[PDB]
């Protein structure tokens, strides 16, 4: 501070951020290359939001595209946070009391807490001043941070895809604000004698984000257009017959009953919802159509397919035999045996697993679908509870005609429920390849701790104890991951878990089914 101005030794040290200028140069070069190859149009701008001369936590990159609507300028922005590992933000202190002693807890600050209302206000004011329009309206298009520990010198493809997707999102939000024809299933008939088919899939390698971030995905449900006519030509050639894709994985929760109902209940968590690669448009009415595919996974109990043992290998991380540790017999059921097969696997699932699953979603305010995750989080509970529900009902009515009131009544029926659970987002490098941090679940913890029930119960309480403070739960969860997974864990963000209403899913499915949608499969 004033010490440097008081002595004034020649030479300058530090006092700068070097992960912003290089990123800006890279983005400008990529934009020039894309424009040269007739991939985009020279109608958007790229600006830098320096933290030093704006006094903000993190520097950011903003992509602004502006149009004119009835003589009123409108600006759409897609900020990209740029976290840096060379500087440390001050931590947040909290105090809890135990008996006669008080202590201080040092928490940690994520990317989500940085992007507050004041941050967006300053960003909007800066953009308005820079573009020469002081009174122009500014609309958000969804933030997307660039993860740290990523070398920008050799990641050109991911940055190019991110830029194109950002331009597409800006176009989408501008078109939505202007007002266009809503997407309806009535226009999907095609009047050519084709049908829509849904294919289920079981995977073992994690899915990847647009920036290489792994995502856990065990069950994948897709929807395709089958146009197989009589003398079909183009053998072995397919024309992009694919519309949606939903990534799901199941987790087990134990109800608190002392020891005919099964002890454990299976809960299915929805991680990612996305459209086809070929489709460059993203509208709110496609999100519900894609999400409706999640309920179809229960046609033949396909959610239990990943649980059955695979032949030849045993990672021993997702073994289902650990479920017998707390059963009537203390020991574990031994799979990987000649006698063991599907004959009594069904018996085990009937006698220890509830037949019906539970549907949950991992909402993230900083993900690719931030604009819908935030809306659903607001609809779950808060000051803006009626408006979000009304907007969701209006969108669902717009998708597929109308008359949704006959199946659902949002006035006296909650849509989404908040379970008060915060999930860390990170990646741990396995011996073979980088994996996802969410691979550690109740079954994984049970497998890691063979017979010590008390440690597992402590881990389970570290997740959803309502009495214990959330910071302590985060500390315990961060300690357990280090204890089990390894030393390569790298956190990247935060996410929240919510539970859909049981009647809402059925009402949505029945409304889509009655609206002229016919999907066939095995």
């Amino acid at each position: 501070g004033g010490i440097n101005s008081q002595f004034t030794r020649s030479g300058n040290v530090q006092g700068g951020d070097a992960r912003a200028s290089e990123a800006l140069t890279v983005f400008t070069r990529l934009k020039e290359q894309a424009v040269a190859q007739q991939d985009l149009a020279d109608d958007f701008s790229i600006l830098r939001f320096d933290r030093d001369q704006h006094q903000v936590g993190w520097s950011s990159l903003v992509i602004a595209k502006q149009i004119s609507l009835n003589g009123q300028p409108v600006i759409a922005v897609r900020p990209l946070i740029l976290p840096n590992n060379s500087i440390e933000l001050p931590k947040r202190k909290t105090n809890i009391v135990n008996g006669m002693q008080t202590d201080v807890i040092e928490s940690d600050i994520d990317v989500g807490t940085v992007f507050s209302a004041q941050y967006f206000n300053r960003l909007s004011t800066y953009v308005q001043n820079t573009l020469g329009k002081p009174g122009a309206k500014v609309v958000l298009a969804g933030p997307f941070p660039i993860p740290a520990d990523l070398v920008l010198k050799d990641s050109e493809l991911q940055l190019r895809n991110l830029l194109i997707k950002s331009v597409n999102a800006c176009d989408d939000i501008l078109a939505l604000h202007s007002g266009e024809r809503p997407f309806t299933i009535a226009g999907l008939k095609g009047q050519q004698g084709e049908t829509l088919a849904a294919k289920v899939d079981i995977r073992t390698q994690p899915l990847h984000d647009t920036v290489g971030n792994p995502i856990r995905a065990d069950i994948v449900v897709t929807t395709q257009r089958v146009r197989r006519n009589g003398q079909q030509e183009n053998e072995f050639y397919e024309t992009d017959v694919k519309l949606n894709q939903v990534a799901m994985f199941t987790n087990l929760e134990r109800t608190p009953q002392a020891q005919t109902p099964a002890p454990w209940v299976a809960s299915v968590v929805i991680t990612d919802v996305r459209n086809a690669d070929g489709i460059q448009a993203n509208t709110p009415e496609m999100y519900w159509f894609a999400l409706s595919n999640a309920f179809r996974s229960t046609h033949g109990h396909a959610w239990a397919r990943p649980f059955l043992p695979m032949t030849g290998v045993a990672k021993d991380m997702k073994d289902i035999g650990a479920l017998g540790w707390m059963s009537a017999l203390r020991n574990r059921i031994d799979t990987k045996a000649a006698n063991f097969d599907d004959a009594q696997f069904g018996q085990l699932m009937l006698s220890q697993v509830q037949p019906n699953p539970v549907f949950q979603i991992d909402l993230n305010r900083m993900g690719e679908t931030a604009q819908m995750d935030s809306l659903q989080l607001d609809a779950a509970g808060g000051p803006n509870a009626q408006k979000a529900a009304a907007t969701i009902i209006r969108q669902i009515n717009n998708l597929g005609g109308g008359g949704f009131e006959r199946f659902f009544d949002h006035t006296t029926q909650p849509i989404l429920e908040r379970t008060g659970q915060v999930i860390d987002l990170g990646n741990w490098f396995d011996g073979d390849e980088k994996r996802d941090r969410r691979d550690l679940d109740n079954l994984a913890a049970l497998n890691a701790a063979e017979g010590n029930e008390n440690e597992f119960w402590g881990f389970y309480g570290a997740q959803l104890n309502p009495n214990l403070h959330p910071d302590l739960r985060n500390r315990q969860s961060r300690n357990y991951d280090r204890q089990y997974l390894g030393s390569t864990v790298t956190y990247t963000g935060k996410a929240e878990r919510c539970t859909y209403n049981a009647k809402f899913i059925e009402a949505l499915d029945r409304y889509l089914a009655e609206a002229g949608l016919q999907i066939t499969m095995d």
Binding site: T255, P256, N356, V358, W457, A502, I519
Partner: peptide, 22 residues
């Protein structure tokens, strides 16, 4: 007070089966 389990997850349960044309 020690945690024992989730007493609210059982309220929300799907009653029907997925309806497909097949």
């Amino acid at each position: 007070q020690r945690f024992m389990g989730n007493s609210v997850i059982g309220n929300n349960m799907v009653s029907g089966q997925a309806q497909v044309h097949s």
